Recover the amino acids of this structure.
DNA sequence: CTAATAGATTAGAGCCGTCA
RNA sequence: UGACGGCUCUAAUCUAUUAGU
């Protein structure tokens, strides 16, 4: 018989120093940390897109319900939750004629038409930013479905612009990076889903029972992208820094030339939460290899340590490098040649490709969430997806898979590593969910890497997450 | 008098009533509501009248399509009107309208002439209006504290929604390996076997290694394919016991320990493949591995001990299938996966991977934990050899024994599955 | 320290770089939204910043 | 450098479900 | 591209050995 261990929920913090395990409940009960006054939005799109956005804004000023209030908390209105004004009166419109959109989406080349459409939108956005008086917090880009259908890299149509990714979203977000304009992209079938139907009279996407969930997600994203703090972690210890490393394939040239990006998280020391990308993309020329050369590893670790020191005033007492790969001896020797003497560097690998499933012998409900199986002093399985008794349901549909956490390098305690990994699953500001299945250090770094891989002209990019997510 | 009495419909206005009551408790007021109490019963009546008559200072009413013409609400309103006449307070009852389907002209006669607070267009301004009215009418209150609402929410609405200390046992998809042959043999067939023989088609699992042959088989086995093997000096065979290389306590210039483990894993995989060929089970070449599944009509009415392995879905028959991989970490195991494959008439697979993906996505939608585990253990038990094991035949007199029951795990924390 | 170099162009350049580096770092790498950046400057800096 | 046989580890795309 | 989860298909690279050399 093998023995399992349980790990308790980490809890998150809200206004008035009140702790809760859910973000929806804590937002409906207490409210967010900071005090915004109101969101002034800029809307660039067609006329019908503008009307759709206005209707949606008018829709979320009132309570919106789900089918079940236990499985899914309801939405009591934007001003009831966030204590700020986001209404369809502080809107500036930048019209985009439909004839231009039709004209540019026909060139029979994905790269060229994608470049033309991104140029069309960002030209108006940039011109409005540079030479106008109205102040805009977030720019809402409404996109028709015909643009979304044909602009994927593997989309079939029934040189100068070839040095870009063939994806509209990533190229759009990368080409606006040097201007630092927070923007949110909406499809036209997302805000008005009742009108778009298939050839049977029914909506293609049915949000009838999950309208409140969509309102929660959209409102939280809009609030965060406008400079609002929705919540923060409540049990982050002092002197510990979390660093996530993610690799991507640059490609789009002769050299695959792998690239690496980082994300950093630590405590502000003012009881805040510092959580920002640490990225100047570091390159490896050899194909298929996901390890840093000594120079790049030294540069990355030096930059991260200097950032922590400048923010806090002292070097960290503990550095956890979470990664999806293993480390070699050259990598870690380069890492250790710049680390200060009185600092502990632990390198942890979080893997998902490891088959193991636990079945309850009687019921039709899966294993409890915070269960873990410790193979050895340096390895353990952890269930981040599973049944949550608070909401009377699980975070998946079939039998969930656990994460295989291995202390690859250094000397640490596996139980504390599991506790920190479970705590890190409660910071997905790009969503409004009970909890994530992966630590956010390895997810936002991936998002940053996939954003600053769609262009080659980016230099000294911004680090705030609101310019990528 | 410190209480603020909230009247509502018990099963319909729960969301708004909870939200407003907890917000008011957070602001520092004292609130009476019937959703803030557990262990109810004879509490109804003879206690409601007492708190309305002797403790209530303001009577907040929630007006909606549900609370209009409800007996308890009307009786409480009558008592509140009598209390309002009893005291010198014309502003004792405050309606709060929330239902867009309740027109202002369809209000019950008791409150048609009262000035209400509007909540339909937004709840924040309604809360602000309530707070301003309370400040203007000097309703009693303490210092603001959101901890009271936090505690009440924890103790009332999170009551039976926690984890429970309960010992439970789980089944997994691992099968422990029970037996290993006593030696690993390297036969020195120095330039005696053909250079391009493709040793993967032999009768027993063998792997080329240097000018040798790594296998569990016997010295002069597989004599059919290699005719010139009888004249072979058995003293030149390199023999290494399996336990020493399994425990990691063997290493030499001939072969490292990791290489030995890798070759053992290869032998185990090939033996499993050959035995599954012996078992006469249909194959399915996936992207990188091979799965195994049963035809229609092979089992007695497609069941193995009251557990279906082949079934129907519209025009396509579904088939439960497994794939197995042998590993030496954490401990020597055979790991099993679960898949569903679809056929037009129970005998020929549909040659459309997109259709297979769509069917497998729409078929596992209704399959819960018990379905998955019952089908998995049924299919595994179907392969069992005699009573409790299953042998992979590594040679003429060599077998590897594997269990037919998966490894159990134990836990001390669970939930109460409250339907 | 900067306002003692006896060369007006050099010290003006140094002061402007010192201020704008901080302002740009605040702008780019942080989630805080600030509309108007108010620069409070001592009197001696203003007096000694003429050709 | 190079063509096969494994095991073991990596990234990339793309589709489907969320009620009950 | 409002999320998240689960699947399937397609590349690499490393290591050992064999034939190339
Ligand atoms: Mg977003």
């Amino acid at each position: 018989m093998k023995e399992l261990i349980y790990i308790e929920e980490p809890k998150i913090l809200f206004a008035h120093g009140q702790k809760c395990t859910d973000a929806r409940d804590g937002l409906a009960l207490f409210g967010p940390l900071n005090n915004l006054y109101g969101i002034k939005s800029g809307v660039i799109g067609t006329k019908q897109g503008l009307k759709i956005f206005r209707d949606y804004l008018d829709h979320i000023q009132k309570p919106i319900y789900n089918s079940n209030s236990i499985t899914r908390p309801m939405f009591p209105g934007f001003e009831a939750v966030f204590d700020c004004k986001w209404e369809s009166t502080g809107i500036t419109f930048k019209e985009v004629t439909n004839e231009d959109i039709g004209k540019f989406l026909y060139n029979s080349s994905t790269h060229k038409r994608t470049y033309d459409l991104v140029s069309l939108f960002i030209d108006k956005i940039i011109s409005a930013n540079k030479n106008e008086d109205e102040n805009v917090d977030v720019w809402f880009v409404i996109v028709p479905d015909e643009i979304y259908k044909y602009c994927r890299p593997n989309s079939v149509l029934p040189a100068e612009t070839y040095n870009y990714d063939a994806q509209f979203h990533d190229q759009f977000k990368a080409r606006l990076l040097k201007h630092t304009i927070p923007t949110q992209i909406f499809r036209e079938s997302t805000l008005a889903w009742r009108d778009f139907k298939n050839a049977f009279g029914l909506p293609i996407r049915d949000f009838s029972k999950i309208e409140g969930h969509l309102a929660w997600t959209i409102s939280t994203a809009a609030f965060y992208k406008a400079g609002g703090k929705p919540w923060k972690l409540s049990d982050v210890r002092n002197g510990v820094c979390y660093l996530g490393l993610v690799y991507k394939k640059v490609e789009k040239s002769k050299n695959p030339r792998n690239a690496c990006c980082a994300a950093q998280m630590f405590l502000d020391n003012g009881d805040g939460t510092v959580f920002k990308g640490e990225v100047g993309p570091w390159y490896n020329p050899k194909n298929g290899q996901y390890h840093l050369e000594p120079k790049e590893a030294k540069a990355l670790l030096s930059q991260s340590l200097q950032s922590y020191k400048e923010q806090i005033g002292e070097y960290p007492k503990e550095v956890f490098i979470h990664a999806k790969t293993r480390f070699n001896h050259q990598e870690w020797d380069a890492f250790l040649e710049v680390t200060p003497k009185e600092t502990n560097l632990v390198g942890v690998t979080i893997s998902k490709t490891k088959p193991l499933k636990l079945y309850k012998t009687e019921g039709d409900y899966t294993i409890l969430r915070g269960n873990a199986y410790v193979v050895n002093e340096r390895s353990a399985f952890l269930w981040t997806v599973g049944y949550v008794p608070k909401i009377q349901t699980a975070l998946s549909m079939e039998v969930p898979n656990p994460l295989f956490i291995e202390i690859n390098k250094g000397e640490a305690d596996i139980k504390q590593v599991l506790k920190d990994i479970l705590s890190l699953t409660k910071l997905n500001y790009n969503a409004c969910i009970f909890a994530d299945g992966e630590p956010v250090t390895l997810r936002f770094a991936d998002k940053i890497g996939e954003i600053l891989t769609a262009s080659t002209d980016i230099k000294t990019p911004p680090l705030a997450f609101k310019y990528y997510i | 008098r410190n209480k603020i009495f909230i009247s509502h419909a018990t099963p319909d206005d729960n969301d708004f009533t909870r939200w407003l009551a907890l917000k008011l408790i957070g602001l520092g007021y004292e609130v009476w509501c019937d959703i803030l109490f557990l262990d109810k019963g004879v509490d109804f009546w003879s206690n409601i009248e007492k708190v309305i008559r002797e403790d209530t200072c303001k009577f907040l009413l929630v007006s909606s399509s549900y609370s209009n013409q409800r007996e308890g609400v009307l009786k409480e309103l009558a008592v509140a009107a009598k209390v309002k006449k009893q005291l010198k307070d014309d502003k004792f009852i405050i309606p709060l309208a929330i239902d867009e389907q309740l027109s202002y002209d369809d209000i019950n006669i008791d409150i048609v002439r009262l000035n209400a607070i509007d909540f339909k267009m937004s709840w924040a301004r309604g809360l602000k209006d309530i707070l301003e009215a309370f400040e203007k009418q000097k309703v009693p209150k303490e210092v603001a504290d959101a901890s009271k609402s936090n505690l009440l929410y924890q103790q009332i609405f999170l009551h039976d929604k926690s984890v429970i200390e309960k010992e439970e046992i789980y089944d997994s998809n691992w099968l422990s390996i029970l037996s290993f042959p006593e030696e690993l043999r390297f036969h020195e067939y120095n330039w005696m076997l053909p250079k391009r023989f493709d040793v993967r088609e032999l009768t027993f699992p063998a792997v080329r290694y240097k000018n040798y042959l790594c296998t569990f088989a016997w010295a002069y086995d597989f004599t059919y394919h290699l005719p010139k093997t009888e004249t072979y000096h058995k003293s030149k065979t390199i023999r290494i016991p399996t336990e020493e290389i399994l425990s990691g306590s063997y290493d030499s210039n001939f072969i490292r320990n990791a290489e030995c483990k890798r070759l053992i894993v290869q032998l185990l995989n090939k033996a499993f493949e050959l035995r599954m060929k012996d078992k006469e089970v249909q194959e399915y070449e996936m992207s990188n591995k091979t799965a195994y599944w049963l035809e229609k009509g092979k089992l007695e009415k497609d069941k193995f001990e009251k557990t279906m392995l082949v079934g129907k879905q519209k025009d396509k028959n579904w088939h439960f299938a497994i794939s197995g991989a042998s590993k030496l970490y954490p401990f020597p195991v055979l790991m099993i996966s679960s898949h569903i494959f679809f056929t037009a008439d129970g005998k020929k697979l549909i040659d459309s991977s997109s259709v297979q993906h769509s069917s497998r996505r729409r078929q596992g939608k209704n399959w819960w934990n018990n379905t998955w585990r019952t089908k998995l253990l049924a299919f595994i038990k179907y392969l069992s050899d005699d009573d409790t094991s299953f042998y992979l035949e590594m040679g003429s007199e060599e077998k590897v024994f594997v269990s037919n029951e998966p490894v159990k795990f134990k836990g001390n924390v669970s939930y109460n599955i409250p339907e």
About this structure: Residues A 221, 430, 469 surround magnesium ion (CB under 6 Å). The longest helix of chain A spans residues 110-130.
